[PDB]
Amino acid sequence: IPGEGHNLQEHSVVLIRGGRVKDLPGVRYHIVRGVYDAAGVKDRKKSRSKYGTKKPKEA
Amino acid sequence: AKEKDTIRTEGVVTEALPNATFRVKLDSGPEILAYISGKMRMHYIRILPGDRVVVEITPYDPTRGRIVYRK
RNA sequence: CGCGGGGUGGAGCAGCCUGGUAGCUCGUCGGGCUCAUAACCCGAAGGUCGUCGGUUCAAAUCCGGCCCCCGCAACCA
RNA sequence: AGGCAAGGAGGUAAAAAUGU
RNA sequence: CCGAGGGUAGGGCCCGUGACUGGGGCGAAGUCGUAACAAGGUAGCUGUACCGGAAGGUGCGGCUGGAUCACCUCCUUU
RNA sequence: GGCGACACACGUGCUACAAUGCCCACUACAAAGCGAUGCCACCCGGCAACGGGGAGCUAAUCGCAAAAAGGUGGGCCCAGUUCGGAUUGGGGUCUGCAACCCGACCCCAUGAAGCCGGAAUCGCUAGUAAUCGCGGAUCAGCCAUGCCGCGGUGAAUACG
RNA sequence: AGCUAGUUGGUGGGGUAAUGGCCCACCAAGGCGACGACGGGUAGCCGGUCUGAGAGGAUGGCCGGCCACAGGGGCACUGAGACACGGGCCCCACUCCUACGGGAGGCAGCAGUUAGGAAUCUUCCGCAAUGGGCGCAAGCCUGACGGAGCGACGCCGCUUGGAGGAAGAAGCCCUUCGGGGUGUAAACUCCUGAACCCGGGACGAAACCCCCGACGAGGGGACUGACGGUACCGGGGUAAUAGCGCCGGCCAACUCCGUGCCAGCAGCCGCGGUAAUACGGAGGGCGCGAGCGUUACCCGGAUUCACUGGGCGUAAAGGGCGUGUAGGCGGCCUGGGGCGUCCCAUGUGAAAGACCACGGCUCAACCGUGGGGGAGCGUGGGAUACGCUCAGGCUAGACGGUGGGAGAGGGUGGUGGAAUUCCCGGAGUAGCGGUGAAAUGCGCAGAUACCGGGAGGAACGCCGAUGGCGAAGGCAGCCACCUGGUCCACCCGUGACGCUGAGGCGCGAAAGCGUGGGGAGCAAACCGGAUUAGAUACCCGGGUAGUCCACGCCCUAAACGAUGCGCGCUAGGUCUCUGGGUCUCCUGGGGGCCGAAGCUAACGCGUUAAGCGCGCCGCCUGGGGAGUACGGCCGCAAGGCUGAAACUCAAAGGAAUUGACGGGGGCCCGCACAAGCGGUGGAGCAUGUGGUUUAAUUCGAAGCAACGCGAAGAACCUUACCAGGCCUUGACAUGCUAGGGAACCCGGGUGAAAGCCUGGGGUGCCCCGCGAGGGGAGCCCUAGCACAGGUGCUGCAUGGC
Ligand SMILES: [Mg+2]
Ligand SMILES: [Mg+2]
Ligand SMILES: [Mg+2]
Ligand SMILES: [Mg+2]
Ligand SMILES: [Mg+2]
Ligand SMILES: [Mg+2]
Ligand SMILES: [Mg+2]
Ligand SMILES: [Mg+2]
Ligand SMILES: [Mg+2]
Ligand SMILES: [Mg+2]
Ligand SMILES: [Mg+2]
Ligand SMILES: [Mg+2]
Ligand SMILES: [Mg+2]
Ligand SMILES: [Mg+2]
Ligand SMILES: [Mg+2]
Ligand SMILES: [Mg+2]
Ligand SMILES: [Mg+2]
Ligand SMILES: [Mg+2]
Ligand SMILES: [Mg+2]
Ligand SMILES: [Mg+2]
Ligand SMILES: [Mg+2]
Ligand SMILES: [Mg+2]
Ligand SMILES: [Mg+2]
Ligand SMILES: [Mg+2]
Ligand SMILES: [Mg+2]
Ligand SMILES: [Mg+2]
Ligand SMILES: [Mg+2]
Ligand SMILES: [Mg+2]
Ligand SMILES: [Mg+2]
Ligand SMILES: [Mg+2]
Ligand SMILES: [Mg+2]
Ligand SMILES: [Mg+2]
Ligand SMILES: [Mg+2]
Ligand SMILES: [Mg+2]
Ligand SMILES: [Mg+2]
Ligand SMILES: [Mg+2]
Ligand SMILES: [Mg+2]
Ligand SMILES: [Mg+2]
Ligand SMILES: [Mg+2]
Ligand SMILES: [Mg+2]
Ligand SMILES: [Mg+2]
Ligand SMILES: [Mg+2]
Ligand SMILES: [Mg+2]
Ligand SMILES: [Mg+2]
Ligand SMILES: [Mg+2]
Ligand SMILES: [Mg+2]
Ligand SMILES: [Mg+2]
Ligand SMILES: [Mg+2]
Ligand SMILES: [Mg+2]
Ligand SMILES: [Mg+2]
Ligand SMILES: [Mg+2]
Ligand SMILES: [Mg+2]
Ligand SMILES: [Mg+2]
Ligand SMILES: [Mg+2]
Ligand SMILES: [Mg+2]
Ligand SMILES: [Mg+2]
Ligand SMILES: [Mg+2]
Predict the structure, then answer these.
(1) Nearest residue on chain B to A45, judged by CA atoms?
(2) Where is the signal peptide (chain A)?
(3) Full residue range of the structural domain in which residue B47 is found
(4) What is the rounded distance in angstroms from the CA atom of residue A40 to the CA atom of residue A30?
(5) Distance between CA atoms of B33 and B15, rounded to whole angstroms?
């Protein structure tokens, strides 16, 4: 799971994009936040798309 | 967000384990797998079994901690 | 109850037997040595030889009894 | 007799674990 | 008659699970030793064998991807 | 008030454990440095620390200051003692506002351990170690046996 | 790794539109196979599509062609044609009705439901076009098709304005406080005028039909739109959506705050543990733009499976060698065949695409038209250099003859001494052996050491080599036998007979195992002793298998030159051994060393190449997993061959280089040890420290290079620590707002002092006024401020030292 901190519990539907993480063992997969139970990275404001964050409203 | 819902609880080091990971017997219940904080590594502050150390525990999985305090 | 052997620095054991003159190893503590730990080395600390007696100028030692500890038998009833 | 060197002797080079 | 298929016994193959076990990789501060890299403190390495907590050890042979080819004393000739 | 606490351990030094010494008395040679509210000649009081009086210098010109070990004479005679000096009691002296914690000094009494030290270890190649005093700086005073400095006596042995 | 029984062929028949094992009866016993059969997996195939410099590699969506299938299987029937997608029959799977006897089903047609799933469309209109079927025709049908709808899914096109407009508004951000950035960007002026409204509005559609003409040609006429009232034209008419990724290197773009190996990022290196150009955010940038990124998958880059184009001594990689089958390759001449090979012609290679030209939709996508190419393949002619093949010949390759030679080549039978042990005999006595020291061990039944003999078994000293032999493993006393290989010399004989070698067959050290023997030493295991923390070990004393032989089997190895074999070329020298010569020098064949050219990553190789080539084989494509699993084979077993993957790591490695290091070497040094004198540690005390205790024992220093150190002077001071009293712009610095008093001195209370509260002398300076009085300088007090202060935390932020 990437981002800034997830909201995922246990019996929750998640979607996977793969792509090796270098550090971790057995884990070749990123969860794609922004779909199903993995709701978007709240407070995220820069690189949105990768994280599933809806547009924040300007002035 | 930078989340400080972190528990800063004391624990007498129980188990000498590999890679400067030490199961430490908390007074917040059992002995979780708690690993050394990087500062300690930098300063070469040695942990042996039997040290009452503050161990940083996130609610997400308390299984793993962090030896925050130098004994 | 009968017989043999032994009881000793904290533990194991030498010395007794052949009168005088108590040692080593492990353990205790301190030091050294080492950059440091063990290892090491050193010491230092520490026994009247189970105990009561007697022997003899003098007993761990010669001798008795008790106290133990080990074992072997304990038969005819 | 010394001079060098080749070879053969034999004596010597003891032992001493680890990692902030 | 031939005949899709079914049934009876046998096998093969794969998939699922599988008690049971082999069990491998990496990991800073786990434990016992210290095998290897320097003649690594008995050269190593190698095949094989037997044995041991474990590295391994030793035997038999092989190799150089092996260092050292010293320093006094004697004999034998230059 | 604390840095000086003290069941302990270590490092660095001093002073020892004696007679190549110790004590007493006389006697003899240094260098280098300092000294102004600083050093203090000399005189008396005091057992003394010092106190008081007081010359001198502004320092090659006075003062600290006696150098000590040494040399002569006396004692001590192998003992824990005339070795040794710690501790502890008492009286004092000085500095300073004040020394109880926590000063130095004098005097008297006290006279502990220690009879040359286990493994280990450190210095030193010549005027050197060993031992003997003196000066200083900081500093009111000093816990200085430290440091820094100066001379006196004066070695050993290096095959390798 | 073998497969096959209608299976391979035959004869006759049937069946078929037709050949045929399609089927059947009978006979034959073949057929296929490593040029890879059968078996398993995989998968419609292709024109193409994507990539690619190309060769290639993958892919086979749409579009076109072919196949195959219509729930799964099996079967026919009818017909020109099916084994029949919306036809039939049957069994089964499944859903549906059922009055339980039986029936009906099949969207892999369009659309839609449902499931699965990351994910994929409207239960659309139309017969207008084009095509299909039927029909004389009208027409009828047509989810073929033509269009529209939904989706940035893809490609392509356009808009989100343009023109001016500051030495630079604000807003935000940074700053060295000046300034810079955003940015002419904005606002504002001017113009245009998507959207949007109204007016018109198609090309696509002229046939089929009717009539003249004979129902022929030809001629006239008519109807005929789902798109769509769309496209498009004419007028009007508004400044009118910007996003997304990145920002350390690759890679284009940099700063600050927040965070502190945390949260986090990551495609790799990696970044984060307090000044992050890598994280979060902000500004700024930079990339693209109605998209942009992520992920998957394919190619590329990967010349990283290499034909173009990599290699193999040490990096992964040469097989252990030999012989040899298939296979591959092959000297020189002459001639023919003409299969390869080339060429020309020509047939093909459908259309679509790709490529060029032009045209059409306002451009372009998209489409149209024309052309060219196109590897391959067939057919006819040609060419013979090269390969093939046939014939003849040659002697350079290769093989043989004869004359010799060297040799630890191999096997079989023997013998010859030293030595060992063991036995007897002798003489002889107090230890031997062993070690870094020792102990176990043997020895008084007399060892050991010495001589005499005998018994064995094993190995072969010196020569002996840096040497010789073999293909390798290997091989040494000597002799005999049998017997291989090889080398030369003559150039005499043969006339290319060769080189290589998947497999196969054979050998194959050492250990091992089986059967039988033999057994001296040595000597795994084992039993002892020491050594040691421990000792399964190094060291010693034994000691069993084994070493030795026969026969059998095992077949591995650093089976090494870590260099596959074969030939040709490409400086030498130097030493060696072995042959011939016209023999202080030539010329062969081996063994080494140095080095030309060249090669190589360097080391090194260098006529014994790793040089230049050619031939063929073996193998390699990151390390670990692992020579392991799994199968298969082989083996009496041990094990061997044959040999993965899953996962995991961003390395495993080679060669060198600089250093460092070595219980590696040589050369050196120093009070480093020795040689010597005096201590330290033991004693007390002086001190400093650690520890401990404290309210605090201030803080640091840490092996040498912390420990009579900072401290060259702690009673208070010092002083940094603690307890108490107290102070606040404050002990000290430069100022401000400013308000009064302000130079100055002397007290008094309280108090441990500091401080606090407080009296009272005390204002002169510049000066204006007659005076009352007024303001400002010095100097000081009060309240807020800017600040002071900190021995407070960091010497891995630093300067100095
Ligand atoms: Mg945490
Ligand atoms: Mg080793
Ligand atoms: Mg026929
Ligand atoms: Mg057939
Ligand atoms: Mg198949
Ligand atoms: Mg398929
Ligand atoms: Mg292809
Ligand atoms: Mg069917
Ligand atoms: Mg028919
Ligand atoms: Mg059908
Ligand atoms: Mg049909
Ligand atoms: Mg069909
Ligand atoms: Mg459908
Ligand atoms: Mg659904
Ligand atoms: Mg679903
Ligand atoms: Mg469609
Ligand atoms: Mg309709
Ligand atoms: Mg009709
Ligand atoms: Mg209909
Ligand atoms: Mg269509
Ligand atoms: Mg503009
Ligand atoms: Mg206008
Ligand atoms: Mg209109
Ligand atoms: Mg850049
Ligand atoms: Mg990012
Ligand atoms: Mg790296
Ligand atoms: Mg990045
Ligand atoms: Mg950032
Ligand atoms: Mg995209
Ligand atoms: Mg290697
Ligand atoms: Mg051959
Ligand atoms: Mg052949
Ligand atoms: Mg050929
Ligand atoms: Mg030829
Ligand atoms: Mg074409
Ligand atoms: Mg065309
Ligand atoms: Mg055009
Ligand atoms: Mg011929
Ligand atoms: Mg010949
Ligand atoms: Mg011959
Ligand atoms: Mg005899
Ligand atoms: Mg001839
Ligand atoms: Mg002839
Ligand atoms: Mg033996
Ligand atoms: Mg032993
Ligand atoms: Mg043993
Ligand atoms: Mg042995
Ligand atoms: Mg055997
Ligand atoms: Mg090999
Ligand atoms: Mg071969
Ligand atoms: Mg040879
Ligand atoms: Mg030669
Ligand atoms: Mg060259
Ligand atoms: Mg060479
Ligand atoms: Mg090469
Ligand atoms: Mg193997
Ligand atoms: Mg197997």
Answers:
(1) B1
(2) none
(3) 1-71
(4) 14
(5) 9
User: What is the number of domains present in chain B?
Assistant: 1
State the count of interchain CB pairs (< 8 A) between A and B: 5
How far, in whole angstroms, is CA B50 from its chain's centroid?
Answer: 12
CATH number for the domain including B65? 2.40.50.140
Taking the C-alpha atoms of B65, B66, B69 and B71 in order, what is their torsion angle to the nearest 10 degrees? 80
* Torsion, Cα of B29, B31, B33, B36 (10° steps): 90
Regarding beta strands B31-35 and B7-16, do their DSSP bridges make them parallel or antiparallel, or are they unpaired?
A: unpaired
Q: What is the 3-state secondary structure (H, E, C) of chain A?
A: CCCCCCCCCCCCCCCEEECCCCCCCCCCCEECCCECCECCCCCCCCCCCCCCCCCCCCC
Tokens of B36: 């050394």
Q: Is the CB of B44 under 7 A from strand D?
A: yes
Experimental method: cryo-EM
Contact: A43, B1; criterion CB under 8 Å = yes
Tokens representing B6 are 């972190």
